[model samples]
Target: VKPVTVKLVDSQATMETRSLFAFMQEQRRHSIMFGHQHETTQGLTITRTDGTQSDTFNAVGDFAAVYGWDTLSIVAPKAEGDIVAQVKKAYARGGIITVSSHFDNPKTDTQKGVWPVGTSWDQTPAVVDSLPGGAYNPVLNGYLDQVAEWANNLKDEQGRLIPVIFRLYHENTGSWFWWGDKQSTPEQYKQLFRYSVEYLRDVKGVRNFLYAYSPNNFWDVTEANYLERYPGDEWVDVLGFDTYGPVADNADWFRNVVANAALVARMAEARGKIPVISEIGIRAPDIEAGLYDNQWYRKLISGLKADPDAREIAFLLVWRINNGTLEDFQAFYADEFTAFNRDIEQVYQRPTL
Candidate 1:
C-alpha cells in the first residue's frame, strides 16, 4: 500500500495558506490595502437614526463601483453564494477581502441580538467558559461552519481560494460588546481565541484565512497594554485596533491614537505581524463637528505618515462610505492623497490581473 501523505502550510494551514500569507507579507513590504466597510451591501441602513446615503450613487458603499477599494470589510456571510459574490467583485477590481464578526449575545439580550452589550458580566464568565462544550458551542459551531465554507470554498474565477484576513472577537479590550474586557476574564478570552482558531483550522479545515487581533479605543495603547489580552502570535497574523472618533475636530486626538498604535507596530516589527489601523472613521450619526474638513482623510493620512512605523500599516479600512453626509463624503473619498481603486492598482501587485 502507498503511504498516505498529508500536507499543511501551518497558519490556518490550507492549500491556499502560502499564497495568502505571501500576498499579505508582500503587501506589507510595499503598500497598504485601502479598505472600507460594507462596500457591496445595499449601501445604507433603514433606521432614521442609523443614517443615509448620497444621491450621486445607487449605494454609498459604491466606492468600489467607481474608484474601487483594495479591501472589502463586511459582516461574515452566512451563505456560500453571498461569500463568493462579494469576493469575485473585489477580485475583479484587483482587491482583497476581510471579515469581521459581530455575533449575537447568546448569554443574554438575544432579542437585541447584534452585540453592543456593555458593563454586564453576571453571566459572561459562564458564557466564556462554555466554549467548544457549552450551549453556546452550537453558535460557535454554526458560525465556524459558515466561515469554514467561507475560507475554504470562497475561490476566485480561476479556482484558487481568495485570500481573506479574518478578524474575530474584535475590540476585545472595550466593553461596548460581549467578548469584550468587561464581559470575559483574560484567561477565558485567551482560551476562547485559541479554541476559535483551532476549531477553524484543525476541526473545520479552514486555511485561506489570516487572523487579526484588535483592541478598540485602548486610550492607553502602550505595548504592554495593547498586548494585554493577546491570545498568542500563533493565532494572529495582523495586529489591529478599531476606533470610531472623538467626533470632535481633533487632529491631535487622532494622532494620539496612531502614536499608541505605533508602539504596537514596533512590537509587530519584532513579532512579524502586520499592523493595521483596522476599522476607523467618524460615524455619520456621530459627526457633530468638522463636517467639511475636506482634508479629513489627509489628516489621517498625515497622522500615519508622521509615524514611520504606524504608516507602514498594511491597510486601514474606513468605516462606511455612505453613512456620512454628502459633503462629509467629499472629504474622505474625494482626496488624491487617499488611495482608492486606481491608486491601489498601482500599489498592490498580485499574481493575476
Candidate 2:
C-alpha cells in the first residue's frame, strides 16, 4: 500500500507557486496545534459586589490544560501588562502563544478611536455598545496597533518575527458577545473583517500573522446561515466552527453535524483555505447512557478523514477542559477519545508531504 504523505503549505504559497493537490497534501501532513481557549482568564472578574473578592484557581488550572492542548491561545487584555507577562511565563511551559486583541465594539459604526488608556473588566461591552449604531469601535484598531508595536519591539537574542494567530470578531452569528448577532448585520460583519485585514496587512505591516475567521455552529445547516456572513476568499485564511453536542440516543444526530459542515468545507476548499474544528465538545453525562459511545470518536475521525473536501482540515480543537462543573461530551467517550488521540498521533508521526 502507498503511504499517505502530508506537509504544511505556507500561507504565502500560491496556486502559481504549487499545484492545488500538492498544497492540500502538504497541509494535511504537518499541521500542529495546541488548542487554546479564549475568555478563560479575561472578561469575568472574581470579585464580590460588596467590594470583596473570589478565587479562580480551579478555573485557571482548567484553562491551563488548553483542552489537553499544548498550544495556548492567550487573549491578553490591553490594560493588563501583568497578565500578559504571566501568559508569557505560561508559554515557556510548552505554550504556543497565539495572541488576539479583542475589541469592545462591532464594525458598523463610523466613530473610530483607540481604547481608552485603562479599559478593563466588563468595560469592553459598554464601550462597544456606546458606538454610533453599535458599530465596531475604532478602539479595536488602536488595540491591534498596540499589538503590532509590541510585536515589532520584541526580539529574542536572534531577531525573528514571533508568529501569532490573530483571530478577530469570531463567532459573528452568536449574540452573547457585543460584536455578535444583534450589533451588526451580515454585510457589516464582512466589512469589519475586511477592514481589520487591510489594517493589519497594509497599515500595521504585520507579516507574521495567520488570520482565522471563526463562527459558532448554531445548528445551522444551510449555506446561507453559515456562509452568508463570510468576507470572501481574500479576507480569510482559516474557517472555524464552535459547536457543542448534547447527549442523545440517536447516533445519526452527531454524524449529521459533521455532514452539515460540508457546506462550508467545500467552499473553503475551492478557495484553497483550511478548515478547523475550532471549538467542539460533547456533553454525554455518563458514558454508558450517552448516544456516542467509545466507538463514536473513531467514527467521527473516520468521517473527517474520508471526506475529500475536508482533507485540508488541520486542527480539531476539543474545548473539553475545566469548563466549571460541566463536563464536555469528549469526557463521556473515554475509549474513543484515547483511540482517536492515538490515531492522530500516529498520523502526525508519519513522514509525508
Candidate 3:
C-alpha cells in the first residue's frame, strides 16, 4: 500500500494530528474502523467509574477502533464522565477519538421549558447569525472557552497532546438545532462554522484538533445540495454525514446510504479530506423494541464494497450503546472490520510516505 498525503487545515497542527490523518487515509483502503459514542464511559448496562473503564466487551469482546464523545460531557456534564480523562484513556489504548458538540442555544433562557439552556435541540431563530458578533456571542464564547481549555488538556502521560476529530454544529442540514439550515441561511451557517474554527484555533491556540463537518441524512443528497452550506475546504479536515439504519431490510434506505457514502468519498478524494459516516445506528424503533438485524453489519459492508468510492470512507460511528441489542453489534468485530486497541496499535505513528 502507498502512503496517502493529507493536507491538514491547521498548518501548526500537532504531529499526532498529521500522523492520524495519514493513518486514516492509509487504513481506509483496507478496512474501515468501528466507532461507538461514549464507548468507554457509558454502555447498555454499565457506566465507567474512575476505578474502571467501560467497553463493548459484552458484545464485541474488544474495544472499538473509534471512540465518540460529546462536548456537553465537559461544559455541562451528566453521567457521561470527564471528556479529557476519557479521551486520554482511549488514546492510551491506541484508539481514535471523535467529539461532537450538542451545543446549547446561546439565546435561550435557562428556565424555558420548551428548550432548556443546555439543549442543542433549540430551534431559536438567528442563533447562527449571533455567533462571534451578535448579542449572544458572550454566552457562546463562555461555552467555547471551556471547550478550548479541555482540548488543550487532552494530553498523553508523556505530556504530548492527543489529537481528536472535533465535529462542530453537526447535522446542521436538519432543522432540529439552532444552526440548522432551516433556521440559518447558508451564509450564516457557513460563517458560524468558520468563526468557531477560527475561535478554537487562532484565538484559543488549540492545535490538536482535526475539524469534521457532518451533515445529516442522505435524502436527495446530491453534491450540489450537500455542499450548499459547506464551510469550505480550509475550514474542514473531514467530510462526514449521518444516516441511521432501517428497522427492517429496507432496500431503498440501503441504496441511499451507499450512494451518498460514495459521493462523500469522491468529494473527499477530490478535496484531499478524510471521509466518514460520522454517526449511525439502527433506527430508533428497532432499538426501542429490542429488535435488530443480525446481518446489518455484513450487508452494509457489502453495500459499500459495491462502490470503490464508498470504500474510501474510513470510519462509521454508531450512537450510544445504551439499550442496544448487544448480540447484534458483534458482527462489527468480524473479519471485515477493524476493532480498537488491536488493529490500531500504531495508529498514531505516521506511515512511510
Candidate 4:
C-alpha cells in the first residue's frame, strides 16, 4: 500500500520557503507542498535551517503549525515571483509542487464588473475562451504563456524542467467561480479544459506538468454525477475534488465523505490516474464554533484510513491555519496517525529525506 502525502501550505515561495521544506522533511511529508499562493500562508512562521532565528507576524495563527501544512498551494500570476525562487528550491529538495488558477470571467459590453467575490458559482463565464474572440486578451495570453514558460523551464541544478501539478478552473460543480455550472455550460467547460491543454501543449509546449479536473462536493456520490464534467480522462492526469464540513463532530458526513473518496479511488484506479483530495477542512474548529471535537484531526484522518480504497490517494491537503489558534493547529499536526511533511519524504522514494 502507498502512503498518503502530507503537504505544507507555503504561500509565497518567498524567504522561509526552503527552510520550511527542510524543517518538515525531518518528520513530516515535506516533499509534497502547496507553495506560494496569495493567502494560504496565513499564520506560518519563518525560520532558518537551525531553527535559531525566526520571523513571524505574531498573528493568532503562528508558524507553530508549519508542520500542519505539507503541500504548497499556488495560483497563477500571483505566484510568478514565488515560482522563480521556490520552484527551483522544490526541485533541489525533491519535493512536489501543485498549481491552480483563478482566471476572471472577463466581462463584455453587457456584463462587466458584476460578479462579486466571496460567493460561489455565480460568475457564469461570458468570455470563457482562450482564443481571440472571447476572454483571450493579450493579458490572458501573456499570463498563461508566462506560467507555461515557468512551468516548462523549471529545472534542478542538473538542468531539467521540473514536473508540476496544474489544476485549472477548479471546483466547477459549484456556482461560485467563473467556470462553474451556473456560469458556463458543461460543453463550454469541457472545451475550456481541452483548449487550455492544447494551448499549453501544442502552442506553448509545456510538457512537465500534470492537469487536474476538480469539482466541488455536494452529496451526489453517484458515478455519473461524479464524472458529470470530467473533461475526458486523456485530458486529465488526476481526479481531484474539494469538500467542506462534517463539522462539530458530524459522523454522518464523515462516513459519506469516506464512501465518496472510495468511489473516486476505484474510478481513478480503473481509469489509470491518481486520485487526490485537493482541499478539505473545517475553518471554525471546536475552539471557534464547537463544531468539531477538539481532536478533530483524529476523526478526519481516521475516517479516510477506515476504508481501503479512499486511503490510496496520493495526498490530502487541509486548508491553512489562518483563522484558527496556533495551539489547535499544532495539536492537529501532532496527531499519531496523521502524516506530516516528513512522512512524505519516506513514502515518495526518499527524494528529500
The best candidate in terms of TM-score: 3
Question: Model 2, 68-155: lDDT tens per residue?
Answer: 1111222244333323443333333323334444553323222334533222212224323333344434556555566666655433
* Candidate 1 overall lDDT versus native: 0.60
**Whole-model Cα lDDT per candidate?**
0.60, 0.47, 0.79, 0.54
- In the range 11-117, model 3's lDDT, one tens digit per residue, is 88887888899888778878878888878777655654441355565566677788888976877543355767767777888889898988777787364565344
- Tens digit of lDDT per residue, candidate 1, span 1-353? 11222222244354444444444554554555557665554344432211122122332243332211221222233221243565566656665567776554545434343433411332353346349667767765665666676567777677777667778778788665668777777877888788878888888877676788877857665777876788888778878888776555767678766785687678777887778777887756655553544456657766775677776676777775443445545554554444444445421222321
Ranking by lDDT: 3, 1, 4, 2
List model 4 lDDT by residue over 1-353, tens digit each. Answer: 22223222212221222232333324322222222222223324543322221122232222221211111222242422344444454444444566676654444323434545422223645435544576544545655676677666666575655556677778888776766787677877787777777777767877565677778764868789887788887687667787677555478777766877777778876775667677666644533654444545556667776678776655566653443445554554555544433334322232221
> How many residue pairs clash in all the candidates, one count each?
0, 12, 0, 35
Inter-residue clash pairs, candidate 3: none
Give the TM-score of each candidate: 0.76, 0.59, 0.91, 0.70
When summed lDDT is taken over every stretch of 10 residues in candidate 4, the lowest stretch is 62-71
Best by lDDT: 3
- Candidate 3 lDDT score at position 30: 81
